[PDB]
Amino acid sequence: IVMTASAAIKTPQMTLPIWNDVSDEQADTFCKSISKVLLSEVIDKVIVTETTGTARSYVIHMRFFDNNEYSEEYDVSKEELQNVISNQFIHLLEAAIVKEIKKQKRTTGPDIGVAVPRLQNSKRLEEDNDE
Amino acid sequence: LRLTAEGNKWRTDILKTSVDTGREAAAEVTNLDKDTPADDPELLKRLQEILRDNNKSGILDAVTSSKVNAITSQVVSKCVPDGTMKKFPCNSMQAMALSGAKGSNVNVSQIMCLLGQQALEGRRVPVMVSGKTLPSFKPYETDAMAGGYVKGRFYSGIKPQEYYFHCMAGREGLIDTAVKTSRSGYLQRCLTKQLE
Amino acid sequence: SEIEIESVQDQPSVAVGSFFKGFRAPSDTTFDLYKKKEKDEFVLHGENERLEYEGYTDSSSQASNQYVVGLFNPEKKSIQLYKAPVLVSKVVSKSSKNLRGPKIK
Amino acid sequence: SVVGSLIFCLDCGDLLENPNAVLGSNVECSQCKAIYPKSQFSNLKVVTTTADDAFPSSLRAKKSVVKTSLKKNELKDGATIKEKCPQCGNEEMNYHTLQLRSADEGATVFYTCTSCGYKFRTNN
Amino acid sequence: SSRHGQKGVCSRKWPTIDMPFSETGIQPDIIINPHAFPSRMTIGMFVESLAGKAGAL
Amino acid sequence: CEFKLELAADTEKLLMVNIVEEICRKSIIRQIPHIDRCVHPEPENGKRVLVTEGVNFQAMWDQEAFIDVDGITSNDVAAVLKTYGVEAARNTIVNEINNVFSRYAISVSFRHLDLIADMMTRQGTYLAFNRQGMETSTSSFMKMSYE
Amino acid sequence: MIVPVRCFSCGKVVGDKWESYLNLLQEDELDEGTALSRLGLKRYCCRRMILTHVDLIEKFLRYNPLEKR
Amino acid sequence: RTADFRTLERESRFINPPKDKSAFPLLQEAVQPHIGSFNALTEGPDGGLLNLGVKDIGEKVIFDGKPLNSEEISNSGYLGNKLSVSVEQVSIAKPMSNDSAVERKVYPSESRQRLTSYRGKLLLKLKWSVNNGEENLFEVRDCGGLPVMLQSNRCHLNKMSPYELVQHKEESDEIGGYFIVNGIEKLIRMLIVQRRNHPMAIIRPSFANRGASYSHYGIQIRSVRPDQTSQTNVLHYLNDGQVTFRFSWRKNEYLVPVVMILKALCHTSDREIFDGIIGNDVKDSFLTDRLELLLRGFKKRYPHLQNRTQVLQYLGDKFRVVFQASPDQSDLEVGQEVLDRIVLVHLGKDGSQDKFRMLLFMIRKLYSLVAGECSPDNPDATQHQEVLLGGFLYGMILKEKIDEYLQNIIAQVRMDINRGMAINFKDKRYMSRVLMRVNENIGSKMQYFLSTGNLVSQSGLDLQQVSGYTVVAEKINFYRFISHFRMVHRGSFFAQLKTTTVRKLLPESWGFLCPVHTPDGSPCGLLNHFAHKCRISTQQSDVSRIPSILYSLGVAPASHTFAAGPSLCCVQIDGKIIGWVSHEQGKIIADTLRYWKVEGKTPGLPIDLEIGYVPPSTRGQYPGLYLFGGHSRMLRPVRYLPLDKEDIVGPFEQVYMNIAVTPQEIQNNVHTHVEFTPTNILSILANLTPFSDFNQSPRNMYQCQMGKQTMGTPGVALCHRSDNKLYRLQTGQTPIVKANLYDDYGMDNFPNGFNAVVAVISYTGYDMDDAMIINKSADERGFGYGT
Amino acid sequence: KAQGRTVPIPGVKQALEKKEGLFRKHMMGKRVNYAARSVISPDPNI
Amino acid sequence: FSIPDGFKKCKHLKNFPLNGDNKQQQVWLIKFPSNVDISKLKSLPVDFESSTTMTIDKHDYKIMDDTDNMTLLVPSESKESLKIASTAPLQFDKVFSVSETAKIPAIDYSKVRVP
Ligand SMILES: [Zn+2]
Ligand SMILES: [Zn+2]
Ligand SMILES: [Zn+2]
């Protein structure tokens, strides 16, 4: 506040006063409706069956939690999950695999013999409180 | 600093229920019905799951602490002052805390009743990878003493296990005074130069 | 259940040599056994058209452990014991004995 | 020997190259020029499952056998001492202890009200 | 300071006539204020006091 | 959800599980801009409220059926200034500084906080007590004796 | 160093009672308490004076820069 | 009938300093890690650390700029005449003074009064080998006055009895452990360093910010040479699935693929590496893919490297400049020279098979950490650390200075051959000419380290800090002085960190590090003090007879078994993986070893041996039977329940051990050991505090700092001293109320206070909280008088 | 603002900003005449 | 090869009864410590699973049995030296390991735990 008048606060918050006609259950459902939901939060298991034939075949099976479980915990429908995977996730996955192929062919390995960067008042720091 | 024979009897009787508290809380966080034994193989496997997670250990520590601190509050409420041998105005230790001359009823209770649960950085006593809080205690021990709950008082003395745990909590405060980069010097200097 | 022993041989005869998981070989090549004279150390050596086999006994294991191999009978219930040394065998290829200049630039 | 996605020579033990990178019908080891394949190696598969710790969520936390979340209501302060409340006048008052400043400096007590829930900090 | 971490500066060198005198006829060498002990909780010094007296007698 | 991915013969070995894992925790199903999580705490002094871990007033304005849009508080001073004006930001400064002191049970007269807030809002903006805020000050000697 | 002249608390001469105290412990084989009583030390202040005396002077004297060996 | 004070006994000992064994052995046991450490520098098996150090620095080669003139392609390749210079032996003499002819003995008292250093003549047999020993020239060269440690192997006081010490102007029960440098008593401060020869799985965010696609996960082993010099090897798990080997030479870091360093050690197949890391757990898809990334990656990057020799040559070619090994040394020689000097040096030369087995174990531990099978090892915890003793540190920097000394001889010859050419190496005249043009005063260089604490080195050792290795042995009072030799610091580098975990008092420190004795403020939790019964390892013995005992107890040999992972127990002796067993049998061996250890019937098993057993757990520490016998180890005595005999325990093995405090607290089926006295967990000064179990925690801590700042007795031999400043209490008194350990350390030799009539009273009005009243008539009578 | 010489001599800008600066160390704050310093001791009779 | 020095070639090798009929044949492997004498023992007590007990001249032993690479080399002829065992590589039917076991004494609690 006083010293930096930061526009980028560490913990930005909003206090929302709820009405009387909105119940404790309705308010908790509303909390879920605004809270950010990630794909990670609805996935239980991912099974990748890498099989090489003819072409690298990658069978990615997304085992999510039960439909009624994540719909009651995140207020997310199956339709909402379909749109995100078919539009965002696959485009994001394809870009990540392409980037990993380029990174593999770019640098074949670290340079041998060439030095790399290191990993990581003296009496004053050893002075006790009475000193 | 002395309690009467009557007052000291109350102290031992309330602190006698504290032995069960350790396992009771351990059985509550772990979610096990009929209150399973302290040496139960399923319980010991369940407490290991808690040991490996910082959040799970936090739930265990906060539950056990609230339960043992409730036993502490009971001892203090019963024994002080209705159980003290010498009483106010003659009990100068009691008088100084009540007058506001020096000290409080909390310091008085650590002297005459018990030190209580030794809290370290909001939680209980630190535990090793083996599940032991000290080489003296059993791995995954479901006891209040093992967690840092000191039944001993400064008048009667404190056991070596309690002594080491008190040393931990005592030092913890001095460590915080050494690692505190926050200073009000520059904050005030910036205001005073613009408001002079 | 006490099992009786028929014969014990303290002389060299049969030997065991560990290679790696999934070792087949041509199964027509020979392995020459060697001995040194408290505890005797053994050396194994074989030869092939494309490969070469070399084996030896571990110095720390020989003086401390004594390995024996036996044949069991299902009716007589008697075992014929023979001392067998364990030889840590490695296989060298035709690609070996390849090297560049001792000093490069 | 063939193990999962890997293929090793039965003669020397050197890891054999992928059949896609080298020429068709036949494959050979870098160490010994051994005759391969036997055509029984097949189009191998490797079932790789997620880390289980990979997706930390509120639902995954609820799937754990032990208590992972504390009740909003069931929250008992850290202990209670019989101290006069400065807010109005109450008997039950919660507390907290720690040793601040020097080893010569006294013990600081952090009081907490029950009727209103007002924090405090007083040394003596 | 005592062997219990109770250090204090010399406020004054009080005369023996002005010093409190015991029934035995002894005036203390050092005077510690009772308001030091409720905050520090140095009970080791309290037991040291009655132990030292018992051992002197 | 099952889907097959076909790669070239030259792509060879790749750690797909680790690649998928990282993208899943990066993929957002639903997110309201600048807001991460909305929680329901215990009613503060009898007032039924919801505490958000983010700031976006215009988004909350659409939730009129649930929220009283004339009482929507925020700790972010700059965000309050941008949407509700200098006087609202001024009131946020006096309230927020008071929250810092009230937590440690320290009482500071509002006459002090109001003066500090008025000095920060003297230019109609949100100036801090530092070299930047000071730039708009008459005395060069005062400035020279600061830094 | 040496036995102090007079008790710090009251002022009763204690300096003449040091060598006499060791004689009551050695030759007479008496206990610490009874030996102090025979010297005429009844106040616990006068009692501790001799009882608690170290006598480092005997250790200090063994270093003499005026005599060889 | 009582726990009385010795009055008659005390005064008799004051007049009569014993002529036999000195009283208070615990006082000499306090300076045992200091004297012992310096003693091992010359005395002991293998001829001491200093003879081992010069044996490890080896030769230093330079070639003459002269042709062959042979009747040829050999002439062009001919480098000239070879000159290999080394040091065979290293000698240290007790302090002497020559006046040019006959030498005289100089004692510490003289050095203090003279305001000079207590130096001993340093000699070292130089080897001047020409054309690979066709003519050898030896010369014992005087290399200045090396400051000698008091009451040590090379001190005139070590034999002396209390009587003899007083006759030589020293304290009757003189401890030693310090160095007299320019009249100032200076000691080498003990340091907390990573436990030797143990792979440590660590999560560090520091590892990520160094390179591209670097994770938090990694392994760190602090390999130590027999000469006590250390060389740390780090393993990194990259997000690509690649594993890299990190090390340090000179003051630069270097990275090499682990599959390259593996194939350089011994001839192996790709499947031998597969069996070495992945055991019977072949179905583990996580491991199946990661290992394929390593093997295929090496084949892709280095397809040419098809044998052990080619790998060594490729390694030699890239490190020929940094390792300075040139110009006749082949890439195969330089390659092996890199391996022998960097990769897992604790197993040493002619142990490449042992280095290979240990490296595979580190890769499996690394993969167990990434997956989560293994919890990360805590470096800040007492279990995963040892104590670098002053004498060992002194030997390390000495080895560094003699390496520099040989480099300087070559530098002078290089100057000579690059100008006037001068003459040949076979002439003694030339050798004598070179040698007196080289600065051979190592004594002054070692005197500097003891006078500044500044570490000047070409490698920088395996330490982070560069200053404060030496501190003045402050003798303001004996309590402060004796605490110096029991004080241990984590490191100067750790003092400048926002992390509080380092300062935190942990249960791992029980009986090793004192919970009370730590300063207030800035050095809180950093400047620790050991427990009074805690001991530090000076060397190792019977270690070679233990594998024979293990193999007989059912340990299957690692060379034949070929199965690795957390699913099986790994048996190791000082970081040497000897075999494999089941976890069930793993505990059986660990319990039966301890039984034959305490029993004096077994000749090959020493009582000081550390048996670190780690049982299998769900996402806990990496399991195994990690045995230790080496130097610098933290050790403490406990009572072993069966047989009722003393047992020596380390901080690593204690973590899983059940040791009861009092015999009445022993619980059935869950206790194997009991403490002798709980006083064993506290320091000397912490034990000296009366009724400490009745005082509040920070007051007991403040008393240690108080007793250290008191105007007590700094000594009785003051008339032969010349110190900066000394504080002396005139009227010292023996405490009526005292711990019996006060007599065990003979603290009556140095009284720190006085017994006073104290009344807890508020009367004057001038006494309140931080102010106390002193009696005028008491002060007038000499109460609390000082000079 | 000057080239490196084989710590340089401070310029007049450096003289005005040595540490806290001439303004802070010798104008806003100053060492004074007719002043004393001593350890404080308690007294209930004054 | 020829190296190392002090090593002499094995010319004479004793006969091994190898047939592998079908009432079937079994090949066993046993691990033994250097302290025990094999020529002294003419009978070995062994039963199925890990459970086993043995006492040879004051020393106690245990015969660990495990179901589950090592390659067996059997001599076909004395002049043919050693060759790899095969039927259709060869594996052992039953694998055993002798481990020296010591009896740790029971803690005398009545003597050590004193009030
Ligand atoms: Zn091959
Ligand atoms: Zn109230
Ligand atoms: Zn007196």
CA dihedral H552, H555, H559, H561 (to 10 degrees): 130
Instruction: Report the half-sphere exposure of A43 (CA within 13 A, side-chain side).
Output: 31
| Distance of alpha carbon G3 from the chain centroid | 5
Q: Do chains D and A touch (3 or more CB pairs under 8 A)?
A: yes
**Residue D122 pairs with which residues in a beta bridge?**
D109
Do residue E38 and residue B110 have CB atoms under 8 angstroms apart? no
Sequence spans of domains, chain G: 1-69
Residues of F engaging I, defined by a Cβ cutoff of 8 Å: 144-145, 147
Could you tell me which chain E residue has the CA closest to the CA of I40?
E11
Q: What is the CATH number of domain H539-630?
A: 3.90.1070.20
**What's the rounded Cα separation, in Å, for the pair F57 and A16?**
10
Q: Look at H292 and D6 and tell me if their CB atoms are within 8 Å.
A: yes
H467 touching A (Cβ < 8 Å):
yes
Going by the DSSP 8-state scheme, the letter that residue H32 receives in this structure is H
Query: Is B138's CB within 8 Å of H510's CB?
Result: no
Show binding-site residues of D for Zn(2+).
9, 12, 29, 32, 85, 88, 113, 116
Q: How open is the CA angle H537-J112-J104, to the nearest 5 degrees?
A: 65
J73–C29 CB contact, under 8 Å: no
* CA dihedral of C58, C59, C63, C68, whole degrees rounded to 10: 20
Pick from F129, F134, F139, F145 the residue to mutate for testing the B interface (most B CBs within 10 Å): F129
| H181 DSSP β-pair partners | H184
Q: Strand order of the sheet with strand J94-100?
A: J43-45, C2-9, C78-83, C65-72, J26-33, J94-100, J59-66, J54-56
Of E26, E52, E53, the CB nearest to G9: E26
The shortest C-alpha distance from E39 to chain B (Å) reads 5
Whether residue H623 has a cis bond before it, omega within 30° of 0: no
Closest CA to E56 of G16, G10, G43, G2: G43
Taking CB atoms and an 8 Å limit, are H11 and G48 in contact across chains? Answer: no
Residues of I in contact with H766 (CB under 8 A): 41-44
CA atoms within 13 A on the CB side of H401: 26
G10 assigned binding-site residue: yes
Mutation target vs H (from J96, J99, J114; most H CBs, 10 A cutoff): J99
Three-state SS across F101-145?
HHHCCCCCCHHHHHHHHHHHCCCCCCCCCCHHHHCCCCCHHHHHC
Chain E contact for I44, CB < 8 A? no
| CA dist., res. D1 & res. D41, Å (int) | 9
Contacts of C88 in chain H (CB under 8 A): 559-560
Distance from CA of G60 to the nearest CA of E (A): 26
Residue of B nearest to D91 (CA): B77
Range of the domain at D116: 1-124
DSSP string, E5-36: S---EEEEEE-TTTS---TTS---SEEE-GGG
CA-to-CA distance for H74 and H57, rounded, in angstroms? 31
Contact yes or no for H48/H42 (Cβ under 8 A): yes
Fold for domain G1-69? Arc Repressor Mutant, subunit A (1.10.10)
Cis geometry, peptide bond prior to residue H199 (ω within 30 degrees of 0): no
Number of folded domains in chain D?
1
Assigned fold of H197-378: 3.90.1110
What does DSSP assign to residue F50? Answer: E
| CB-based contact A119 H207, cutoff 8 Å | yes
In the block, residue with structure tokens 């492997």: J29
Q: Name the closest residue on chain B to residue F115, using Cα atoms.
A: B195
- Identity of the residue in D67, D82, D102 whose CB atom sits nearest the CB atom of B59: D67
Domain membership of residue B145 as a residue range: 1-159
| Helix or strand run (H / E) with residue A83 | helix A78-84
* CA–CA distance, H385 with H366 (Å, rounded to integer): 20
Strands H527-529, H535-536: pairing is: unpaired
If you measure from the C-alpha of residue D94 to the centroid of ligand 2, how many angstroms do you get, rounded to a whole number?
Answer: 11
- The shortest CB-CB distance from H783 to any of E29, E40, E45 is to E29
- Ligand minimally distant from the alpha carbon of residue D91: 2
Distance from CA of C17 to the nearest CA of J (A): 6
Annotate I1-46 with DSSP letters as a single string. --PPP--PPP-HHHHHTSSS-HHHHHTSS---SS---------S--
> How many Å lie between the centroid of ligand 3 and the Cα of residue H775?
13
Of H617, H678, H697, the CB nearest to B166: H697
Can you tell me the distance from the alpha carbon of H713 to that of H732, in angstroms, rounded to the nearest whole number? 8
Q: Which residue has the tokens 């049969």?
A: C14
The answer to whether A48 contacts chain B (CB < 8 Å) is no
Amino acid at H176: G
Nearest to H525 among B110, B130, B171 (CB): B171
CA of B31 to the centre of ligand 2 (A): 36
- Which of H562, H596, H666 has its CB closest to that of J102? H596
The alpha carbon of residue F16 is apart from the nearest alpha carbon of chain H, in Å, by 10
Chain B / chain D CB contacts < 8 angstroms: 89
Q: Could you write out the DSSP letters of every residue in H593-614? A: HHHHHHSTT-SSS-TT-EEEEE
Q: Per the structure block, which two tokens stand in for H592? A: 């039966």
Contact H292 F13 (CB under 8 A): yes
Nearest CB to H520: which of A110, A113, A129?
A129
What lies within 8 Å, CB to CB, of H167 at 6+ separation is G69
Looking at the complex, report in whole angstroms how far the Cα of residue D67 sits from the nearest Cα belonging to chain B. Answer: 5
H509: nearest CA partner in chain B:
B134
Q: CA C41: distance to chain centroid?
A: 11
Burial H25-51 (b: 16+ CB within 10 A, else e): eebbebbbbbbbbbbbbbeeeeebbbb
Nearest CA in chain B to D83: B105
Q: Phi and psi dihedrals of H478, rounded to 5? A: -60, -40
Which stretches of H96-134 are assigned E, i.e. beta strand?
96-98, 103-105, 119-130
Neighbours of chain G (3+ CB pairs under 8 A): E, H
Chain I partners of H764 at a C-beta cutoff of 8 Å? none
User: Are the Cβ atoms of H289 and F13 closer than 8 angstroms?
Assistant: yes
Nearest CA of chain H to the CA of F12: how many Å? 10
CATH number of the CATH domain containing B38: 1.10.132.30
Residue H188 buriedness (CB in 10 A; 0-12 / 13-18 / 19+): buried
Strands H190-194 and H487-489, sheet pairing:
parallel
The ligand whose atoms approach the alpha carbon of E27 most closely is 3
Q: How far is the CA of C33 from the centre of ligand 3 (A)?
A: 97
Instruction: Find the discontinuities in chain A where C to next N exceeds 2.5 angstroms and give the residue preceding each.
Output: 54, 120
Please tell me the total count of domains within chain J: 1
- Can you give the residue ranges of every domain in chain C? 1-105
**For I4-37, b where at least 16 C-beta lie within 10 A, e where not — what string?**
eeeeeeeeeeeeeeeeebebbeeeeeeeeeeeee
The number of beta carbons lying within 10 Å of the beta carbon of residue F76 is 22
Angle between the N-to-C axes of helices B92-99 and B105-112, in degrees from 0 to 180, rounded to the nearest 10: 160
Q: Where are the alpha helices (DSSP H) in D1-124?
A: 58-62
Domains H197-378 and H539-630 share a fold: no
Which residues from chain H sit within 8 angstroms of residue A118, using beta carbons? 252-253
- How many angstroms from the chain centroid is the CA of residue H657? 25
CA gap H716, H704 in Å, rounded:
23
Interface probe with A: pick from F66, F69, F98, most Cβ of A within 10 Å: F66
Using CA atoms, how far apart are residues D55 and A43, in angstroms rounded to an integer? 7
Residues of B in contact with A2 (CB under 8 A): 187, 190-191
Nearest CB to J44; choose among C3, C65, C69: C3
CB atoms within 10 A of CB B162: 20
End-to-end, the C-alpha distance of chain B in Å comes to 53
Q: What values do phi and psi take at J30, rounded to 5?
A: -130, 135
